[PDB]
Structure 1
Amino acid sequence: KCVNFNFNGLTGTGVLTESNKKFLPFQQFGRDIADTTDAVRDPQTLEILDITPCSFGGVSVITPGTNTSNQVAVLYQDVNCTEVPVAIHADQLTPTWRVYSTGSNVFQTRAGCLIGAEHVNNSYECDIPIGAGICASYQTQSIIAYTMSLGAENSVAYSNNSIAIPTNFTISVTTEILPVSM
Structure 2
Amino acid sequence: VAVLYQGVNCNVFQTRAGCLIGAEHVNNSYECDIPIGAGICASYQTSQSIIAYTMSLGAENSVAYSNNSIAIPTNFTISVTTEILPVSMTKTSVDCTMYICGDSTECSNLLL
Query: Same fold by TM-score, threshold 0.5 exceeded?
Result: yes
In the alignment, does 2:5 pair up with 1:76?
yes
* Structure 1 range deviating more: 136-145 or 107-116: 136-145
In structure 1, the gaps of 5 or more residues are 1-71, 82-104
Give the whole-Å Cα distance in 2 for the aligned partners of 1:157 and 1:122.
28
Question: Higher relative contact order at CA 8 Å, sep ≥6: structure 1 or structure 2?
Answer: 2
- Partner residue, 1:170: 77
Q: How does 1:20-169 map to 2 (within 5 A)?
A: 72-81=1-10, 105-140=11-46, 141-169=48-76
Give the % identical residues: 99
**TM-score (norm: length of structure 2):** 0.74
User: Which structure shows the bigger proportion of residues in helix conformation?
Assistant: 2
User: Which structure shows the bigger proportion of residues in strand conformation?
Assistant: 1
Aligned-residue offset at 1:113? 0.5
In structure 2, the gaps of 5 or more residues are 90-112
Query: What are the superposed Cα offsets for residues 39-58 of structure 1, whole Å, 9 maximum, x if unpaired?
Result: xxxxxxxxxxxxxxxxxxxx
One-letter identity of the residue aligned with 1:177: I
Aligned-residue offset at 1:80? 1.1
Aligned-residue offset at 1:122? 1.1
Question: Helix, strand or coil: the match of 2:78?
Answer: strand
Aligned-residue offset at 1:76? 1.1
One-letter identity of the residue aligned with 1:131: G
**TM-score (norm: length of structure 1):** 0.47
Q: How does 1:10-29 map to 2 (within 5 A)?
A: none
Aligned-residue offset at 1:155? 2.2
